[PDB]
């Protein structure tokens, strides 16, 4: 079902997506242990993910949530990093993309800081890092994350000592 369309670096859409990635890097309290040591990225490619079935599934749930929350889907764009990005783009998010041991329960996690999602690209806590060099701070290997459309509806506010 899925087709991937390359965006041109001269297109304003590419440029706005890169700006979201780059502007939401921060330092992490682990010193870079999980995700590596960096202040910015080299963006190599940005692809638009197109799948009519998955889209209609999303927008059907979106309208349900809107109607339960004073006509406000509370839709955001957020980052998701994991080793399963290739399954997500063909089959969608599901229970097998849940962080069963996460702070807020077994669910699917997203971040406003692109650098937070980067800590999960090679696994929980960065796993053992890249496949080729076993290096969580690899400057060579190509990484992938998703910039996702996410419906929050009425969101329970949980203040977190983090």
């Amino acid at each position: 079902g899925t087709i991937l369309i390359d965006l041109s670096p001269d297109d304003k859409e590419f440029q706005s997506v890169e700006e979201e990635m780059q502007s939401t890097v921060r330092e992490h309290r682990d010193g870079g242990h999980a995700g590596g040591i960096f202040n910015r990225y080299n963006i190599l490619k940005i692809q638009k993910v197109c799948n009519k079935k998955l889209w209609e599934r999303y927008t059907h749930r979106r309208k349900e949530v809107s109607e339960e929350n004073h006509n406000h889907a509370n839709e955001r764009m957020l980052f998701h990093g994991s080793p399963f990005v290739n399954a997500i783009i063909h089959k969608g998010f599901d229970e097998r993309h849940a962080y069963i041991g996460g702070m807020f329960g077994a669910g699917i996690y997203f971040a406003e800081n692109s650098s937070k999602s980067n800590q999960y690209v090679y696994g929980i806590g960065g796993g053992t890092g890249c496949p080729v060099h076993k290096d969580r701070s690899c400057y060579i290997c190509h990484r992938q994350l998703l910039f996702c459309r996410v419906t929050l509806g009425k969101s329970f506010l949980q203040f977190s000592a983090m």
Partner: protein, 47 residues
Amino acid sequence: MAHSPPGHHSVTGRPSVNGLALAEYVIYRGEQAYPEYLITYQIMRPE
């Protein structure tokens, strides 16, 4: 997979100690997210 607290659709994890960390969010249904952009990248070694 867990469920949202009753009467809610998601959880917002708002960091209270580090005032530069932005929010994290959890959903409990896969159909509440669409993977719109696939970004391929390298992290860069600082100078």
